[PDB]
Design a protein around this ligand. Structure first.
Ligand SMILES: *[C@@H]1O[C@H](CO)[C@@H](O[C@@H]2O[C@H](CO)[C@@H](O[C@@H]3O[C@H](CO[C@H]4O[C@H](CO[C@H]5O[C@H](CO)[C@@H](O)[C@H](O)[C@@H]5O)[C@@H](O)[C@H](O[C@H]5O[C@H](CO)[C@@H](O)[C@H](O)[C@@H]5O)[C@@H]4O)[C@@H](O)[C@H](O)[C@@H]3O)[C@H](O)[C@H]2NC(C)=O)[C@H](O)[C@H]1NC(C)=O
Ligand SMILES: *[C@@H]1O[C@H](CO)[C@@H](O[C@@H]2O[C@H](CO)[C@@H](O)[C@H](O)[C@H]2NC(C)=O)[C@H](O)[C@H]1NC(C)=O
Lengths: 210, 226
């Protein structure tokens, strides 16, 4: 239900509505960020609610040949979201569906070095006959990442749960990795290390039982 | 205005989902209200709306399984979805709908139509549909680098979301980072919430993390000590 739109940073993005109006149209443009509340960007073909920046503008229904287009001038990294085109007209009637959403992906964003934090298992966890190591990566761009675990020289292939880099608080990616072991396995090897590969670059954090 | 959603978090299939929308900053009798949802992997699906005359209109795709009601005593909107299935798992938003009249000719000739646009929304409530039961989360401390150190709380083995993690209520805001939840092979979720605290602040300042899981009705305050 998503159409990719890879636009350049600092340029104008024109989102064409997937639905073609059959006559006199009333077009609404909604902005929806994941995990947030959808925002009403444009509520009439040329109307803009209060507080909405002037960089957003729609095509008014002057003539019939005008295709509904949401214009975003000077796009920033904070404009990456889903854009819904709620279409109304005389010959379609009540349009209950929000239509296909166009997901904006701003490009040319500067690279960010990943910040990796490694936490060993807890004592209250070791006494619970379990032991999970936490590898938290944060503040990196783009979302391409490769998390690996190494028990000293030996690698670890099973027992690894890694999340998707969905986190975009400051428009930077962040993910989590969990290595589940038993207390005997945790105290067995000398040290466990989380090796994160971002843009090919390898950063490694290491912990040990103490 | 301000809108807040409340839900059960988990409903077994072949039952009745029910969510509530608390409104504030304006009267409830002089506005069109509406319910909208978004399922994982699906876009926004308009559920229905209710007018100021308490005459509701629903999406014909829900097969008339939805009922929207309004209560003026508590100024709350209510949505009930009967006979839920795995597909009904979605985040439910309540919004305020405005009706605009779009005229392209003679008003007497019916050459006009009405369109609806929602201006104010709510952050939404996450309601999952599953036959399993809610499990209380286990919270463990992660004791603590450029004059600072990482101090976190690890929430594990809970089902399902939402789950809120705070740090000393609103006293701790800088450095508070709550990473996204992981979905393990067992169907259980887990997340981590870390804070970057100056090294000198350790030993003298207390940092307690408050974890709340609404579906299982659990509230735990854990203090992390280095
Ligand atoms: C035989 O007679 C017929 C009837 O007299 C006539 O039918 C007319 O046909 C024309 C075109 O053929 C149509 O023109 C179209 O009208 C629509 C509707 O415009 C009206 O409504 C909008 C919406 O107003 C709302 O919002 C404003 C705030 O923005 C509020 O104040 C308002 O209360 C509403 O809530 C409105 O914006 C329009 O106002 C514009 O125009 C007036 C003109 O007096 C200005 O004063 C005003 O500032 C503004 O510029 C207007 O009130 C319009 O949107 C289209 O663009 C299009 O122009 C007529 O609707 C239609 N009916 C009537 C009653 O006129 C036939 O054409 C005629 N045939 C022949 C051969 O003579
Ligand atoms: C009325 O119908 C004509 C028939 O085509 C329309 O004319 C076309 O309009 C589109 C608009 O994008 C142009 O690309 C075509 O080249 C036009 N074709 C011709 C043969 O003119 C016209 O737009 C319709 N509407 C009005 C108001 O005239």
């Amino acid at each position: 239900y998503v159409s990719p739109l890879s636009v350049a940073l600092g340029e104008t993005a024109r989102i064409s509505c997937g639905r073609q109006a059959l006559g006199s149209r009333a077009v609404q443009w909604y902005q929806h960020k994941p995990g947030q509340a959808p925002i009403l960007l444009i509520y009439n073909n040329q109307d803009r609610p209060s507080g909405i920046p002037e960089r957003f503008s729609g095509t008014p229904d002057i003539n019939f040949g005008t295709t509904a287009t949401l214009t975003i001038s000077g796009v920033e990294v904070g404009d990456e979201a889903d854009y819904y085109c709620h279409m109304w007209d005389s010959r379609s009637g009540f349009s209950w569906s929000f239509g296909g959403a166009t997901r904006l992906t701003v490009l040319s964003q500067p690279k960010a070095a990943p910040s990796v934090t490694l936490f060993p298992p807890s004592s209250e966890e070791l006494q619970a006959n379990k032991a999970t190591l936490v590898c938290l990566i944060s503040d990196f761009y783009p979302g391409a990442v490769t998390v690996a675990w190494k028990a000293d020289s030996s690698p670890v292939k099973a027992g690894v749960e890694t999340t998707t880099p969905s986190k975009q608080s400051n428009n930077k990616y962040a993910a989590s990795s969990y290595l589940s072991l038993t207390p005997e396995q945790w105290k067995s090897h000398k040290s466990y290390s989380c090796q994160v590969t971002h843009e090919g670059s390898t950063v490694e954090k290491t912990v040990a039982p103490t | 205005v301000q809108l807040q959603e409340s839900g059960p978090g988990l409903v077994r299939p072949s039952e009745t989902l029910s969510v509530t929308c608390i409104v504030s900053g304006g009267s409830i009798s002089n506005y069109y209200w509406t319910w909208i949802r978004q399922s994982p992997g699906k876009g926004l699906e308009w559920i229905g709306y209710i007018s100021d005359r308490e005459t509701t209109t629903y999406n014909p795709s829900l097969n008339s399984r939805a009922v929207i009601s309004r209560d003026t005593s508590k100024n709350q909107l209510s949505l009930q979805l009967r006979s839920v299935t795995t597909a009904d798992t979605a985040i439910y938003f309540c919004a305020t709908a405005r009706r605009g009249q779009r005229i392209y000719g003679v008003v007497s000739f019916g050459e006009f139509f009405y369109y609806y646009y929602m201006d104010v929304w709510g952050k939404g409530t996450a309601v999952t549909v599953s036959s399993a039961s809610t499990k209380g989360p286990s919270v463990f401390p992660l004791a603590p680098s450029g004059g600072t150190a990482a101090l976190g709380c690890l929430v594990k083995d809970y089902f399902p979301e939402p789950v809120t993690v705070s740090w000393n209520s609103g006293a701790l805001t800088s450095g508070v980072h709550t990473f996204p939840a992981v979905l393990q092979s067992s169907g259980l979720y887990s997340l981590s919430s870390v804070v970057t605290v100056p090294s000198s602040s350790l030993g003298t300042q207390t940092y307690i993390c408050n974890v709340n899981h609404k579906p299982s009705n659990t509230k735990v305050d854990k203090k992390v000590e280095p």
